[PDB]
């Protein structure tokens, strides 16, 4: 199918990853780069986010998922499902919103496309109504991540797709803070792209710190397999 060649062709191999995020958050503003790699093979992804303005001031795990679907191992009897490559190189637009249970939420809106043989991530974050003392502007969330599933549902009136999924955050005190995830995806070119039957993408996230780095930073490690059409 030389559809499924020229995105698979672009993602075959070990593949530079650099992300820019401009955040605003109750008016506490900030900017992250993020730069690694990913190996769609494996559904690998290893990148490190640093936040070049001081002081984060929202937790880390906040942020993952703002943080790359294209990246994402497709077997080869769901290639036909894989939105994300389809897009490529021109690239697609991933929006959200994420309602903190009891707190503010995020909008956020991406581009997501190669520059050169780097797949660039460019990311505006604007954040209200959160509580200054609350779970996320009191950083009470743990430094850790949990698995979970992401359902893909096709978007055909918008040539897309829309994307639903909780993340639970665990807070220090032991219970859980809910991230209700909404989110659609359009291409940025006017070719045609694949649009998918259901299915979901299954990430594992692994957080962790660089012993080397002073500044103020996440290393993220994420494995992410396609599934749900047998």
């Given at each position: 199918d030389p559809m499924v060649s020229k995105g698979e062709e672009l993602f075959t191999g070990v593949v530079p990853i650099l992300v820019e995020l401009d955040g605003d958050v109750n008016g506490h503003k900030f900017s992250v780069s993020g730069e690694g790699e990913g190996d769609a093979t494996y559904g690998?992804?290893?990148?490190?986010?640093?936040?070049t303005t001081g002081k984060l001031p929202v937790p880390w795990p906040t942020l993952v998922t703002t943080f790359?679907?294209?990246f994402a191992r497709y077997p080869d009897h769901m290639k036909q499902h894989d939105f994300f490559k389809?897009?490529?190189?021109?690239?697609?637009v991933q929006e959200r919103t994420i309602f903190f249970k009891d707190d503010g939420n995020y909008k956020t809106r991406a581009e997501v496309k190669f520059e050169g043989d780097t797949l660039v991530n460019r990311?505006?974050?604007?954040?209200?109504?959160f509580k200054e003392d609350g779970n996320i502007l009191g950083h009470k969330l743990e430094y850790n991540y949990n698995s979970?599933?992401?359902y893909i549902m096709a978007d055909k009136q918008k040539n897309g797709i829309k994307v639903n999924f909780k993340i639970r955050h665990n807070i220090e005190d032991?219970?859980?803070q809910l991230a209700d995830h909404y989110q659609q995806?359009?291409?940025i070119g006017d070719g045609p792209v694949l649009l998918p039957d259901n299915h979901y993408l299954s990430y594992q996230s692994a957080l962790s710190k660089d012993p080397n780095e002073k500044r103020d930073h996440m290393v993220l490690l994420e494995f992410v397999t396609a599934a749900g059409i047998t």
């Amino acid at each position: 199918d030389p559809m499924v060649s020229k995105g698979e062709e672009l993602f075959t191999g070990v593949v530079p990853i650099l992300v820019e995020l401009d955040g605003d958050v109750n008016g506490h503003k900030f900017s992250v780069s993020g730069e690694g790699e990913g190996d769609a093979t494996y559904g690998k992804l290893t990148l490190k986010f640093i936040c070049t303005t001081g002081k984060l001031p929202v937790p880390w795990p906040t942020l993952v998922t703002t943080f790359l679907m294209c990246f994402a191992r497709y077997p080869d009897h769901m290639k036909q499902h894989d939105f994300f490559k389809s897009a490529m190189p021109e690239g697609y637009v991933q929006e959200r919103t994420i309602f903190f249970k009891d707190d503010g939420n995020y909008k956020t809106r991406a581009e997501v496309k190669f520059e050169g043989d780097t797949l660039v991530n460019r990311i505006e974050l604007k954040g209200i109504d959160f509580k200054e003392d609350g779970n996320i502007l009191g950083h009470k969330l743990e430094y850790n991540y949990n698995s979970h599933n992401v359902y893909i549902m096709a978007d055909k009136q918008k040539n897309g797709i829309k994307v639903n999924f909780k993340i639970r955050h665990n807070i220090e005190d032991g219970s859980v803070q809910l991230a209700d995830h909404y989110q659609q995806n359009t291409p940025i070119g006017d070719g045609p792209v694949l649009l998918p039957d259901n299915h979901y993408l299954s990430y594992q996230s692994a957080l962790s710190k660089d012993p080397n780095e002073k500044r103020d930073h996440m290393v993220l490690l994420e494995f992410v397999t396609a599934a749900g059409i047998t």
